[PDB]
Amino acid sequence: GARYVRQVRESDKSRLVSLLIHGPAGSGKTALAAEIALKSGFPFIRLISPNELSGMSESAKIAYIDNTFRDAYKSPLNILVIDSLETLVDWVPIGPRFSNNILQMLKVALKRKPPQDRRLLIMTTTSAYSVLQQMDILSCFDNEIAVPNMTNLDELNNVMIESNFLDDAGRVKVINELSRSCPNFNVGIKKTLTNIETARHDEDPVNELVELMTQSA
Amino acid sequence: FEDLGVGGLDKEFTKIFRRAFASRIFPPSVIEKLGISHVKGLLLYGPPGTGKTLIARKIGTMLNAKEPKIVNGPEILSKYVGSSEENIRNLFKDAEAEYRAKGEESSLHIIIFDELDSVFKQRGGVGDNVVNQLLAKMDGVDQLNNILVIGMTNRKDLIDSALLRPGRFEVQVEIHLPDEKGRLQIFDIQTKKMRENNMMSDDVNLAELAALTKNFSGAEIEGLVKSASSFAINKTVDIAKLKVTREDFLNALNDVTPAFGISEEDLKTCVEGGMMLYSERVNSILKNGARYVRQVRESDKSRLVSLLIHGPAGSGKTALAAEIALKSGFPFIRLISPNELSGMSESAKIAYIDNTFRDAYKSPLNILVIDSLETLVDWVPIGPRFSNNILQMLKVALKRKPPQDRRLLIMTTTSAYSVLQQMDILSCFDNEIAVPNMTNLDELNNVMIESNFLDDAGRVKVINELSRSCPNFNVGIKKTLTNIETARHDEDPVNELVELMTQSA
Amino acid sequence: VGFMNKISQINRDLDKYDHTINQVDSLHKRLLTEVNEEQASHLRHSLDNFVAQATDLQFKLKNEIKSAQRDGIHDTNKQAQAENSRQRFLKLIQDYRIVDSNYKEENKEQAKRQYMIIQPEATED
Ligand SMILES: Nc1ncnc2c1ncn2[C@@H]1O[C@H](COP(=O)(O)OP(=O)(O)OP(=O)(O)O)[C@@H](O)[C@H]1O
Ligand SMILES: Nc1ncnc2c1ncn2[C@@H]1O[C@H](COP(=O)(O)OP(=O)(O)O)[C@@H](O)[C@H]1O
Numbered sequence: 001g002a003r004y005v006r007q008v009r010e011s012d013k014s015r016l017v018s019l020l021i022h023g024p025a026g027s028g029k030t031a032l033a034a035e036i037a038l039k040s041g042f043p044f045i046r047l048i049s050p051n052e053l054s055g056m057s058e059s060a061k062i063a064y065i066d067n068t069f070r071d072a073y074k075s076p077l078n079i080l081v082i083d084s085l086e087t088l089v090d091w092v093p094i095g096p097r098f099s100n101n102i103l104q105m106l107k108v109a110l111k112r113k114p115p116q117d118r119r120l121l122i123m124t125t126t127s128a129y130s131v132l133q134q135m136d137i138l139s140c141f142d143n144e145i146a147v148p149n150m151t152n153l154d155e156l157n158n159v160m161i162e163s164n165f166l167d168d169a170g171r172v173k174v175i176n177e178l179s180r181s182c183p184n185f186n187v188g189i190k191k192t193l194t195n196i197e198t199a200r201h202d203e204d205p206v207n208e209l210v211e212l213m214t215q216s217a
Numbered sequence: 218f219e220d221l222g223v224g225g226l227d228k229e230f231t232k233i234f235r236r237a238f239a240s241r242i243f244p245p246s247v248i249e250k251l252g253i254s255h256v257k258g259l260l261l262y263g264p265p266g267t268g269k270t271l272i273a274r275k276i277g278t279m280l281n282a283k284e285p286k287i288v289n290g291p292e293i294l295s296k297y298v299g300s301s302e303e304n305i306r307n308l309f310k311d312a313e314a315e316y317r318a319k320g321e322e323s324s325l326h327i328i329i330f331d332e333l334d335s336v337f338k339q340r341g342g343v344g345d346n347v348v349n350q351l352l353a354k355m356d357g358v359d360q361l362n363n364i365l366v367i368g369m370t371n372r373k374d375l376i377d378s379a380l381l382r383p384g385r386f387e388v389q390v391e392i393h394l395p396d397e398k399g400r401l402q403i404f405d406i407q408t409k410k411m412r413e414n415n416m417m418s419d420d421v422n423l424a425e426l427a428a429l430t431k432n433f434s435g436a437e438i439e440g441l442v443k444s445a446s447s448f449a450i451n452k453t454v455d456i457a458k459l460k461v462t463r464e465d466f467l468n469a470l471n472d473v474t475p476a477f478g479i480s481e482e483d484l485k486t487c488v489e490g491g492m493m494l495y496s497e498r499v500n501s502i503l504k505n506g507a508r509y510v511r512q513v514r515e516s517d518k519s520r521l522v523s524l525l526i527h528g529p530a531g532s533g534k535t536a537l538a539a540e541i542a543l544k545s546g547f548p549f550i551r552l553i554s555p556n557e558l559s560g561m562s563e564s565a566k567i568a569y570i571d572n573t574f575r576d577a578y579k580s581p582l583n584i585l586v587i588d589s590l591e592t593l594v595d596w597v598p599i600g601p602r603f604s605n606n607i608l609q610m611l612k613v614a615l616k617r618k619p620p621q622d623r624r625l626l627i628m629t630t631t632s633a634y635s636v637l638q639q640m641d642i643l644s645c646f647d648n649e650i651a652v653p654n655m656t657n658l659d660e661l662n663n664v665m666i667e668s669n670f671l672d673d674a675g676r677v678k679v680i681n682e683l684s685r686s687c688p689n690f691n692v693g694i695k696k697t698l699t700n701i702e703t704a705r706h707d708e709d710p711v712n713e714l715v716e717l718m719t720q721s722a
Numbered sequence: 723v724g725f726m727n728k729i730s731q732i733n734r735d736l737d738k739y740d741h742t743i744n745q746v747d748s749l750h751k752r753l754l755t756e757v758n759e760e761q762a763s764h765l766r767h768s769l770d771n772f773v774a775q776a777t778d779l780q781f782k783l784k785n786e787i788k789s790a791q792r793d794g795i796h797d798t799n800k801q802a803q804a805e806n807s808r809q810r811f812l813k814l815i816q817d818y819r820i821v822d823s824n825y826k827e828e829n830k831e832q833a834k835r836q837y838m839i840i841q842p843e844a845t846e847d
Contacts, residue, residue, distance in 0.1 A: 498778070501781065501785075505781075527770075527774070528770075528771075528774045529770060529771045529774065598764060599760075632770070633767070633770070634769075634770045634773060635767045635769060635770055636767075638829070639829070649777060650777070651773070651774035651775070651776075651777035651778050652774065653771065653774045653775050653778060654771075
């Protein structure tokens with residue numbers, strides 16, 4: 001991400017760039033996106049999420065989105081982040097049904113060069129890569145990052161020590177127990193944090209957490 | 218500050234005084250030597266019934282301004298072209314006149330808009346003209362710096378972007394609900410006529426009263442006190458010593474219903490049939506609920522929890538949710554069920570739901586229950602059909618963390634598990650409770666003693682007959698209760714109860 | 723003699739809980755097979771009244787196994803019994819997880835099947 005930031009800041013021709021962060025749900029994409037955004041110093045940063053787009057009508061959706069692009073042209077350096085495309089559009093699988101016009105608006109918007117050599121970067125996030133392939137939108141993007149899950153116990157121990165949840169015998173007990181209790185291990189960090197916290201309160205010893213860690217995978 | 222009749226609002230007056238009046242108090246020689254204009258607009262926002270009109274009014278009297286000129290949002294509109302906006306223009310005439318005549322020694326004017334978002338939405342119809350008209354005049358080509366305009370609203374995130382620029386509406390302020398200190402002070406201010414004039418007994422301790430009332434809005438306290446005094450006097454009719462004692466206060470406190478408090482009545486109605494522990498599960502379920510309530514109250518990071526309860530139809534699912542709620546003591550409790558929503562239009566339902574969500578974020582501590590999902594979503598299996606928009610509303614809602622340290626528990630119930638997985642919604646929910654129906658005869662025994670269906674002979678014979686007849690007994694509680702009543706009010710228990718009960722399983 | 727009765731209770735419950743998992747497995751497979759016929763299609767949704775009991779037995783075995791392991795702290799044999807119950811219950815949990823994952827993976831494929839093709843003529847409005 002840092003490389004991309006530098007690349008966009010200083011290049012005569014490269015006025016427009018589009019990335020895609022994809023991964024399984026709960027792998028924690030938005031956090032990374034925000035982290036990339038914050039450490040760039042680009043003066044204009046603004047965010048679109050379903051959070052803001054709640055309970056208005058469809059025309060309002062389009063109007064708001066349109067405004068949010070329009071104002072971005074009026075500044076020298078800009079970065080926009082889009083959360084959960086496949087959710088702005090109303091995807092639901094049976095039928096399947098979803099709204100068309102918003103999809104089209106985004107399809108058009110993601111290709112527009114800003115006027116007078118002003119500079120723009122776009123990040124977007126999704127958890128449903130396959131349907132994006134299906135709808136035939138994937139053309140619009142220049143590149144693609146991938147984020148997988150955690151898949152080893154040592155990583156989990158790193159997580160525990162960062163939480164300072166573990167004791168010294170506790171880590172050995174839990175790690176060994178899960179080492180023999182679960183051959184394959186793969187879960188999202190979000191759930192992991194939830195689990196550690198719910199385990200921190202009641203029955204602090206290894207047990208509750210062990211069966212809970214199983215109860216995630 | 219507090220010499221005047223407003224309790225609990227302290228920081229707000231420091232901020233407002235510092236920013237607004239610190240440039241109108243000193244002699245004009247100084248501030249002119251300073252060369253700074255005056256703030257010409259104000260936006261204070263908050264939930265209704267918190268005392269916004271009052272603060273707005275008192276400000277003018279402090280500055281010895283002219284009498285306020287008042288208008289409310291929706292009334293501005295007319296149905297002829299350009300008179301809807303003429304009215305907006307009329308308001309500034311006298312200020313213009315006095316400015317041109319006198320000059321810089323004119324007396325300050327005040328104007329109050331009410332419900333500003335009712336007309337002034339983002340632009341880009343009459344609406345654009347109205348917004349335009351206000352812009353061009355609020356700060357126009359001609360200088361006019363002897364005026365002040367005050368703004369009152371509930372939704373700040375819908376006003377057009379341009380009015381909130383430095384020059385038109387500079388100071389934005391928030392008004393939140395009173396704290397405990399607020400309630401105590403409110404009582405102190407309100408009960409002044411009673412106090413000096415000596416018609417309150419010495420037994421009433423208003424501090425206790427303040428503690429007892431939570432999430433009271435600050436207006437309704439007045440309602441409480443006037444009701445209590447009226448109660449006392451009406452009880453009197455004698456002029457010996459018209460005293461208001463604590464009993465009036467307790468009565469009136471009991472009577473009133475706050476807006477941001479428990480909605481007890483519908484929950485009591487929900488559990489009208491009673492809670493008898495006919496088996497062992499019930500205890501366990503309630504224990505689970507209590508556990509989760511504790512987890513919500515005590516933690517810091519887990520500011521929201523979503524908990525689902527499901528089971529077969531007629532298993533008596535909703536009652537447990539109501540029971541768990543009622544045995545908790547949280548200040549804020551509301552219920553959403555198909556019952557309210559029946560008959561409305563689609564837009565109406567989405568609006569209702571979304572309002573009902575936003576209100577809770579204000580209170581410190583909240584539980585919120587949803588009665589049924591497939592019903593709200595308008596499911597019908599042939600085709601199938603249902604409304605997508607409401608579904609999305611709910612889906613989005615169940616992830617929103619409270620905007621601040623406020624806390625929320627969401628409870629929901631359904632009977633159609635399978636559908637929900639085929640919908641791909643199941644990821645909303647962290648934990649699940651299951652409610653199976655009865656498959657035993659001793660459970661029938663427990664329920665029928667609790668209902669006192671009949672004398673022991675009938676009871677024993679029917680359990681014997683069903684033992685020898687139905688081996689794999691399996692029904693929910695609904696049919697059990699209704700069938701028992703039907704047999705009771707009918708004749709000859711074996712003739713129906715046994716037969717029905719077989720026919721039902 | 724009470725303790726051994728408790729362990730027998732655990733054993734008998736674990737046996738039923740295994741049984742219910744297998745019944746559920748069958749309910750899955752036949753729900754995948756038959757997509758066409760209306761009423762029987764609705765009929766396999768009795769799987770609900772198989773899932774609920776699985777959850778309840780899970781919660782029971784949770785509490786009694788915790789109580790048993792607490793009770794066996796001072797006797798090695800009691801501890802061994804508790805650990806055996808833990809192992810078996812863990813295996814059951816693993817079986818449940820496997821069934822769930824397989825079914826989720828199968829439901830995706832059927833979903834892909836149905837709409838990856840030209841569709842019935844357009845709707846009303
Ligand atoms: N322990 C209990 N078991 C069963 N029913 C109970 C119990 N306690 C109370 N009830 C009764 O159950 C009824 C309320 O439950 P409710 O009507 O919501 O059942 P439900 O299955 O959710 O309804 P529906 O079949 O429409 O989904 C009342 O008559 C209430 O008294
Ligand atoms: N903080 C408060 N202190 C004293 N009185 C209050 C307060 N808040 C509301 N009130 C009472 O409620 C009435 C004012 O209504 P107000 O709450 O300003 O209207 P709204 O908030 O609906 O615009 C007055 O009788 C006022 O005394």
